[PDB]
XYZ file of C-alpha atoms in Angstrom:
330
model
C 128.933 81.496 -9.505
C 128.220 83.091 -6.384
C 129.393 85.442 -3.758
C 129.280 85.982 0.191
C 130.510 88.177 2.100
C 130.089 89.954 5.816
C 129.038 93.717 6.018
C 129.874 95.424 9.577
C 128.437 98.585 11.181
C 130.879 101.284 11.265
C 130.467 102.442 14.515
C 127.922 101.763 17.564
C 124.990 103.434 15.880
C 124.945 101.538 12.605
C 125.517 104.940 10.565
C 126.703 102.782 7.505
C 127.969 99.197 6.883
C 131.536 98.317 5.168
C 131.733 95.199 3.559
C 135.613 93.984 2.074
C 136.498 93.873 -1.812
C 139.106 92.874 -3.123
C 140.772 95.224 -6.004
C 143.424 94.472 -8.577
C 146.492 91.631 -8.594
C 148.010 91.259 -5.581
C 144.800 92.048 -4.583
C 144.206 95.264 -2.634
C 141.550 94.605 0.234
C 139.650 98.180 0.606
C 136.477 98.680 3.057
C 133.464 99.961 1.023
C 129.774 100.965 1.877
C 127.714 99.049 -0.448
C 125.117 101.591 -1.866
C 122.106 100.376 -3.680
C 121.008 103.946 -4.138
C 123.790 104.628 -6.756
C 125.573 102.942 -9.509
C 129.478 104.349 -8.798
C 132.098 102.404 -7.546
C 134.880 104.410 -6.266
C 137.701 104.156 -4.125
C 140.088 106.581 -2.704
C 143.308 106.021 -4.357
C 146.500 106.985 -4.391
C 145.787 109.835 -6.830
C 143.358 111.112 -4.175
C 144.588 114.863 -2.611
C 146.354 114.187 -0.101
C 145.172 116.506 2.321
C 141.247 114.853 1.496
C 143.037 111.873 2.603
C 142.532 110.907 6.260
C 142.834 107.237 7.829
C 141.633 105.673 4.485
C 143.158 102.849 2.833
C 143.971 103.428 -0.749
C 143.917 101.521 -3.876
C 146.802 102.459 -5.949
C 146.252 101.048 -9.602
C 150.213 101.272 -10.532
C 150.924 98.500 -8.174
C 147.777 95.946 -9.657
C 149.517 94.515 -12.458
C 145.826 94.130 -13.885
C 144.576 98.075 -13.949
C 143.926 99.262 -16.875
C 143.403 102.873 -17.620
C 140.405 103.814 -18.830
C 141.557 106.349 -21.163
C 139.492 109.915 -21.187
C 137.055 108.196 -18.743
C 136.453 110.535 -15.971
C 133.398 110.742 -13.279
C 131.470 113.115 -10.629
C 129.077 112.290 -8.319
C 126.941 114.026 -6.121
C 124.945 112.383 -2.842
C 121.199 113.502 -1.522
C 123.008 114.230 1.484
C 125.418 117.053 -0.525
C 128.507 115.125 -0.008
C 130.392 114.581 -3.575
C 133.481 113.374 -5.079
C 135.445 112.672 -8.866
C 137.977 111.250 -10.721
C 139.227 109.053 -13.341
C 138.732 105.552 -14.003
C 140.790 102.239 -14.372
C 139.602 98.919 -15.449
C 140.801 96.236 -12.612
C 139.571 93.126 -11.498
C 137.370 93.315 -8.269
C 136.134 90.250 -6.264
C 133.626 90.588 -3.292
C 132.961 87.630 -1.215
C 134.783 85.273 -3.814
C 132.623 86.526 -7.192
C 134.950 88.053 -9.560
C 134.598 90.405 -12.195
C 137.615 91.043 -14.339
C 137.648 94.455 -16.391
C 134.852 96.043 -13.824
C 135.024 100.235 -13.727
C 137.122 101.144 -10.404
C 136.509 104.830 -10.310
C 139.694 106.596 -8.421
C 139.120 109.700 -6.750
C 140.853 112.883 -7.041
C 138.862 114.691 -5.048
C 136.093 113.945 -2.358
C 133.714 116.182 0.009
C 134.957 116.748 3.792
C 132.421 114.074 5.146
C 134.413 111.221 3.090
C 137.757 112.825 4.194
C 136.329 112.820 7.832
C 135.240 109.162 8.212
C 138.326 106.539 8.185
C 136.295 103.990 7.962
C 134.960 103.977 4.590
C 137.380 103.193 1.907
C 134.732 104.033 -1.030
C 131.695 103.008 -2.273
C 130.185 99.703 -4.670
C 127.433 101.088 -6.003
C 123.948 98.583 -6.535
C 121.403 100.890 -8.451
C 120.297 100.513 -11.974
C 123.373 100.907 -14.408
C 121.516 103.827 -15.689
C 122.945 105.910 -13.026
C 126.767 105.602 -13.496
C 128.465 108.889 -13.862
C 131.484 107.809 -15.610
C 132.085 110.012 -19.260
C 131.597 109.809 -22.055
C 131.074 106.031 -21.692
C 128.781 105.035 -19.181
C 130.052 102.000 -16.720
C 128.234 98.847 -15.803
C 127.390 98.270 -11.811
C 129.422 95.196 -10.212
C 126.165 93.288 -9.961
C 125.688 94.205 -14.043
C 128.847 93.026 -14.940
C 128.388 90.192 -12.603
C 124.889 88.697 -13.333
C 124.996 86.730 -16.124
C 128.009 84.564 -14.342
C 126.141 84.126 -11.435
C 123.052 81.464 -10.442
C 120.751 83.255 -10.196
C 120.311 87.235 -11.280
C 120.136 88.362 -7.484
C 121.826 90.015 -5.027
C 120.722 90.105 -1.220
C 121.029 92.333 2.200
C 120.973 90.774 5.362
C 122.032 94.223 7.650
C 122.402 93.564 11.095
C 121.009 96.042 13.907
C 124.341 96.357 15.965
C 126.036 93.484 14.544
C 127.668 92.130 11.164
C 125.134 91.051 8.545
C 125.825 89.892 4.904
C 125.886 90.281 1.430
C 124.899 87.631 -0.953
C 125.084 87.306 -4.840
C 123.399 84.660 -6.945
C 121.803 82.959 -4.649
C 118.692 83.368 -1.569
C 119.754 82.192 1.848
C 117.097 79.922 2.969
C 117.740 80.164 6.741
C 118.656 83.513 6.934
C 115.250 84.443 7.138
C 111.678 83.196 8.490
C 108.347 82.516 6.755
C 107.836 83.261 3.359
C 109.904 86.366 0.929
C 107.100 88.632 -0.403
C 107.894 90.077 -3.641
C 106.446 93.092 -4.794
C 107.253 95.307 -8.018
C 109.915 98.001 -9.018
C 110.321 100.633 -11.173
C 113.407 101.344 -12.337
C 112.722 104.567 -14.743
C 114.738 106.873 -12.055
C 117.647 104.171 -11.715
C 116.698 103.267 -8.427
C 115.251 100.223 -6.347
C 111.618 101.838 -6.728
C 108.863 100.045 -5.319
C 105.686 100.779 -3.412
C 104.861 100.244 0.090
C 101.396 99.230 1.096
C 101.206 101.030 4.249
C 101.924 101.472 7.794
C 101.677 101.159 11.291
C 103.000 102.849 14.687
C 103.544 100.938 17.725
C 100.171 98.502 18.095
C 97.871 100.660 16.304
C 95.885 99.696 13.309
C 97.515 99.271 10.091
C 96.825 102.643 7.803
C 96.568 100.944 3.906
C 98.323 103.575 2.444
C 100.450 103.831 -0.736
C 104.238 104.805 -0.120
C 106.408 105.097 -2.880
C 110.289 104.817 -1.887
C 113.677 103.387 -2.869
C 114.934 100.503 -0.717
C 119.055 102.130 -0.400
C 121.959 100.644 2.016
C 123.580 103.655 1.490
C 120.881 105.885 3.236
C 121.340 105.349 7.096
C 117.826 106.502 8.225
C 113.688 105.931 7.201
C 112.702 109.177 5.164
C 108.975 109.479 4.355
C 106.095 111.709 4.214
C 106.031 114.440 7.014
C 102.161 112.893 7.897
C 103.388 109.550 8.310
C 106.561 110.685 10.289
C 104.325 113.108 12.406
C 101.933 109.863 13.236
C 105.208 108.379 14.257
C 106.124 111.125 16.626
C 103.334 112.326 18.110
C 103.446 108.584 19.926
C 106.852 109.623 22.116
C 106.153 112.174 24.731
C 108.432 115.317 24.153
C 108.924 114.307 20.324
C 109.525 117.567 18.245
C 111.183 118.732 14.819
C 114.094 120.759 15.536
C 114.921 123.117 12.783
C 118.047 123.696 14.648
C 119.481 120.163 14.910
C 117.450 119.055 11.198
C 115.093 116.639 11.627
C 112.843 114.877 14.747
C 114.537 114.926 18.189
C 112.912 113.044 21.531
C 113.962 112.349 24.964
C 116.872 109.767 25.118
C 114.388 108.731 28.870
C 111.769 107.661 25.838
C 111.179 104.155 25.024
C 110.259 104.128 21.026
C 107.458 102.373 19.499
C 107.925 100.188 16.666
C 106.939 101.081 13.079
C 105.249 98.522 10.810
C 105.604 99.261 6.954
C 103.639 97.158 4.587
C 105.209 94.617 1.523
C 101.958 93.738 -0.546
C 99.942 91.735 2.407
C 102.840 91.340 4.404
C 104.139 93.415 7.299
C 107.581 93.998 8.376
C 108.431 95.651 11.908
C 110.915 98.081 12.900
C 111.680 97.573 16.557
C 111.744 100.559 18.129
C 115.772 100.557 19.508
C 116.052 100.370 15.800
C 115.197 104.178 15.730
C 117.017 105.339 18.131
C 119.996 107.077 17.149
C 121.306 108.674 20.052
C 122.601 112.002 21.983
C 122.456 114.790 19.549
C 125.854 115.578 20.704
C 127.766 113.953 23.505
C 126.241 114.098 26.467
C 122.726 115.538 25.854
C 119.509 114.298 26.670
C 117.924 114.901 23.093
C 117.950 111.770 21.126
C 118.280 112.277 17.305
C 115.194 110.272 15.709
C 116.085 107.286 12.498
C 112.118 108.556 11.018
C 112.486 112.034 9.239
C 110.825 113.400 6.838
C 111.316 113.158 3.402
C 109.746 116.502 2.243
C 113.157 118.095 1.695
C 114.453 115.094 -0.711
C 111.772 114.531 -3.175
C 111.494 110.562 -2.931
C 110.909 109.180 -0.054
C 113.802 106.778 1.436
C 113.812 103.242 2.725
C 117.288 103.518 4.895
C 118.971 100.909 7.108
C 116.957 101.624 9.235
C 114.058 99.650 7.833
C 116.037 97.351 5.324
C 118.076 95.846 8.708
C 114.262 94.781 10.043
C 114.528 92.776 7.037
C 116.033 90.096 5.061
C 115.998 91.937 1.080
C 116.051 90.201 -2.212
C 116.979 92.558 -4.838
C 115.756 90.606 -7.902
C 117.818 92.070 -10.747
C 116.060 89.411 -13.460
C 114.950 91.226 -16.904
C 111.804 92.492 -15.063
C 113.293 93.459 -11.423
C 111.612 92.475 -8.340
C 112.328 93.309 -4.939
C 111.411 90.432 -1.691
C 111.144 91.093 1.810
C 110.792 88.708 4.629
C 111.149 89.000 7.973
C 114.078 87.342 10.025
C-alpha cells in the first residue's frame, strides 16, 4: 500500500504545515501538524476543556462507530518549546492520504497548553519519531508509520515541505520527480527516539564549505534551524545590523537586509537554504527588526534541523530495520 497526501503552511510565514487525516467511521477529517520529532498522535476532541478549545475542529470518538476505548490508557506530553498537553486514548481507524491503519492509538486531549488553544489551525498532531517515544501508559503506542509499515511498499515515509506553498507527504514509496539529481543517504541513530543523524558541515552565503561534524534531528514539527551558537554566529555576522536579542529570544536583523544562503552538508553532498528561506519577518507588526529562522541551539541540548532546512529539501525517512535518512535537492 501506499499513501499521499498535501501538507499546507499555516499561515504566510510557514510557522508549521497541516496535512488532512481522516479519523474514525464516518470519517472525521481533522488538520494535523505532522511531527517527526515525536511519536504522539493527538487530537483535540470533544472531551477537550472547553474553554482550551478555540477554532479547532474536534474528533469526537462517540460518534465513530469504530473507537474503541483504550481502557486505563492515558498520556502527557511535553514540547522543547514548553507547550504540553494530555489525555486518554481510543483505538480508531485513521487514514492519511488513502493508507489506513485500523486500531491505531488516537490520543484525545483533555487538556492542552495556551499556544495549542491559541492557534485554530492545528487540529493535533501525527507524530513520526521512533515508537520509543510514545507517552501513552502503562502500554506504550505504536507511531502511524509503525503500525503502518509492514502494509506498505516500501518501509518509508517522505517530506516534500514547500517554502510558501503546499508540499507533500508520502508513505511507501520515493517520488522520482519530486526531486533532482541523486538522494544521498546518510546514517541515524535512533537511541534518543529521534531522526538522529550527522551533518557534514556548512557553509554561509558563497564562502568555503567548513567540514564540520553537526549532530541534529531532522523534525517537521520544529519551524526554525537550531545549531551551535559558532555556526549561527558565522551565519550572522554576514547581515549588517545582525544581533542576539535577549529581549525578543534569539537573532534579530534588519527586515532592509537581504539574507545569505546557508549550505549544510549530507555526506559529500550539499543542500542550500535560500536565504528568503530565513527570513521570518517583523518581530511584531510593523517593526523594522526581522526575527532570524538560524538560532542557536545552546538552550535545547540537540541541535535542530527545522523546516527551515528540511523545505530546501526533498527527505527520505528510511524507517527499514536499520533506519536511514536521504536528502536531495529539488
Amino acid at each position: 500500500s501506499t499513501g499521499s497526501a498535501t501538507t499546507t503552511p499555516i499561515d504566510s510565514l510557514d510557522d508549521a504545515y497541516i496535512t488532512p487525516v481522516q479519523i474514525g467511521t464516518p470519517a472525521q477529517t481533522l488538520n494535523l501538524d505532522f511531527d517527526t520529532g515525536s511519536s504522539d498522535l493527538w487530537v483535540f476532541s470533544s472531551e477537550t476543556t472547553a474553554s482550551e478549545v478555540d477554532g479547532q475542529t474536534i474528533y469526537t470518538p462517540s460518534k465513530s462507530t469504530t473507537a474503541k476505548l483504550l481502557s486505563g490508557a492515558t498520556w502527557s506530553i511535553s514540547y522543547g518549546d514548553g507547550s504540553s498537553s494530555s489525555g486518554d486514548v481510543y483505538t480508531d481507524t485513521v487514514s492519511v492520504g488513502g493508507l489506513t491503519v485500523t486500531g491505531q492509538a488516537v490520543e484525545s486531549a483533555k487538556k492542552v497548553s495556551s499556544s495549542f488553544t491559541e492557534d485554530s489551525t492545528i487540529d493535533g498532531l501525527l507524530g513520526l519519531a521512533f515508537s520509543t517515544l510514545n507517552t501513552v501508559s502503562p502500554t506504550q503506542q505504536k507511531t502511524f508509520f509503525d503500525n503502518a509499515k509492514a502494509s506498505l511498499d516500501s518501509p518509508v515515509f517522505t517530506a516534500d515541505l514547500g517554502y510558501h506553498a503546499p508540499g507533500t507527504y508520502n508513505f511507501g514509496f520515493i517520488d522520482t520527480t519530486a526531486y533532482t539529481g541523486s538522494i544521498t543517504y546518510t546514517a541515524v541513530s535512533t537511541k534518543q527516539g529521534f531522526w538522529e543523524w550527522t551533518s557534514t558541515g556548512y557553509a554561509v552565503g558563497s564562502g568555503t564549505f567548513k567540514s564540520t561534524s553537526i549532530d541534529g534531528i531532522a523534525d517537521t514539527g520544529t519551524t526554525l534551524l537550531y545549531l551551535p551558537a559558532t555556526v549561527v554566529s558565522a551565519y550572522w555576522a554576514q547581515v549588517s545590523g545582525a544581533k542576539s536579542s535577549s529581549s525578543v529570544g534569539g537573532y534579530v536583523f534588519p527586515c532592509s537586509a537581504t539574507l545569505p544562503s546557508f549550505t549544510f552538508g549530507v555526506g559529500s553532498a550539499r543542500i542550500v537554504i535560500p536565504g528568503d528561506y530565513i527570513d521570518f519577518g517583523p518581530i511584531s507588526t510593523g517593526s523594522s527588526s526581522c526575527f532570524g529562522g538560524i538560532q542557536s541551539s545552546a538552550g535545547i541540548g540537540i541541535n535542530i534541523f527545522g523546516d527551515v532546512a528540511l523545505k530546501a529539501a526533498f527527505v527520505v525517512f528510511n524507517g527499514a530495520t536499520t533506519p536511514t535518512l536521504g536528502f536531495a535537492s529539488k
